[PDB]
Amino acid sequence: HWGYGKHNGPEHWHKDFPIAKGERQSPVDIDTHTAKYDPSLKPLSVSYDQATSLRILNNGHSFQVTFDDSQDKAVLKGGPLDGTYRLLQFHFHWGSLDGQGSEHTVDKKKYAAELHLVHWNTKYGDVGKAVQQPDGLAVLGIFLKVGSAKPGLQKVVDVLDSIKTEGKSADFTNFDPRGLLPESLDYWTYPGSLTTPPLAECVTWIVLKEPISVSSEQVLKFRKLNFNGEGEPEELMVDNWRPAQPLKNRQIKASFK
Ligand SMILES: COc1cc2c3c(ccc2cc1OS(N)(=O)=O)[C@@H]1CC[C@H](OS(N)(=O)=O)[C@@]1(C)C=C3
Numbered sequence: 001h002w003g004y005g006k007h008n009g010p011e012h013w014h015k016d017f018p019i020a021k022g023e024r025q026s027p028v029d030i031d032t033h034t035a036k037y038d039p040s041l042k043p044l045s046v047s048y049d050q051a052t053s054l055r056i057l058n059n060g061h062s063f064q065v066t067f068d069d070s071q072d073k074a075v076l077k078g079g080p081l082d083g084t085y086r087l088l089q090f091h092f093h094w095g096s097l098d099g100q101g102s103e104h105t106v107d108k109k110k111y112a113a114e115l116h117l118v119h120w121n122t123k124y125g126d127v128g129k130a131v132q133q134p135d136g137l138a139v140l141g142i143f144l145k146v147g148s149a150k151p152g153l154q155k156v157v158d159v160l161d162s163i164k165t166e167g168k169s170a171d172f173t174n175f176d177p178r179g180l181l182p183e184s185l186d187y188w189t190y191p192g193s194l195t196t197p198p199l200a201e202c203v204t205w206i207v208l209k210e211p212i213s214v215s216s217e218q219v220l221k222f223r224k225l226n227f228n229g230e231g232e233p234e235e236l237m238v239d240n241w242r243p244a245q246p247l248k249n250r251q252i253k254a255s256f257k
């Protein structure tokens with residue numbers, strides 16, 4: 001089964017998922033001098049005041065917080081998007097050292113981690129249908145740098161002991177994802193893919209320019225999770241990021257100058 005190890009990592013994924021070598025794979029390096037400012041792009045509209053978090057889960061490749069997506073409660077609109085996209089989950093990618101961990105890079109700069117807020121287009125009725133469409137998902141990507149602590153992340157950090165190994169989950173209610181956003185919503189956007197199998201080419205990526213800062217003690221606790229299930233040889237969950245893929249026929253747009 002796929003993973004991030006030497007014998008099952010990203011360089012192997014194309015054997016089971018041949019779309020790994022496709023034309024709109026993610027992540028990419030964002031070349032800030034080649035991205036084009038597009039005045040047609042609109043501000044993002046993030047409406048998370050009514051979000052209902054449900055559960056937090058170690059899925060063996062990351063940890064994720066899931067939300068109730070049965071109604072328009074936490075939605076993303078505007079920017080490059082047509083229509084309304086509902087928040088389903090968020091999860092992170094991070095490194096073994098502070099100089100790596102993000103999936104997207106900016107002028108080849110890697111950040112310590114990257115937060116993905118995954119949303120699906122309500123036109124398609126359920127997330128399984130949306131993954132089959134070129135405009136089915138919108139993922140908001142936020143970089144993490146190491147510095148001052150982020151108070152709104154601490155509730156996540158404190159529960160990670162209870163989901164240390166693959167398949168563990170816990171109730172995780174009343175978590176407000178607004179505490180994870182930077183002050184600015186300036187963004188880059190391009191058409192891309194999921195960065196894990198099945199690598200489907202269904203994602204409008206919206207990558208925020210401004211990182212959030214987290215403390216070294218906060219990111220340390222990510223690195224103590226396990227890829228393995230309980231009672232198996234311990235392997236720390238680190239470096240669960242896919243390296244940058246070829247941009248090919250694509251243009252990255254910026255909402256700012
Ligand atoms: C990082 O992993 C991501 C996985 C995503 C998935 C899905 C949607 C978004 C995902 C986003 C993921 O994050 S990431 N790194 O590209 O932003 C699936 C849609 C239907 C599918 O279910 S099925 N029956 O094929 O087992 C889902 C729920 C499975 C994975």
Ligand SMILES: [Zn+2]
Nearest residue numbers: 091093116195
């Ligand atoms: Zn992700």
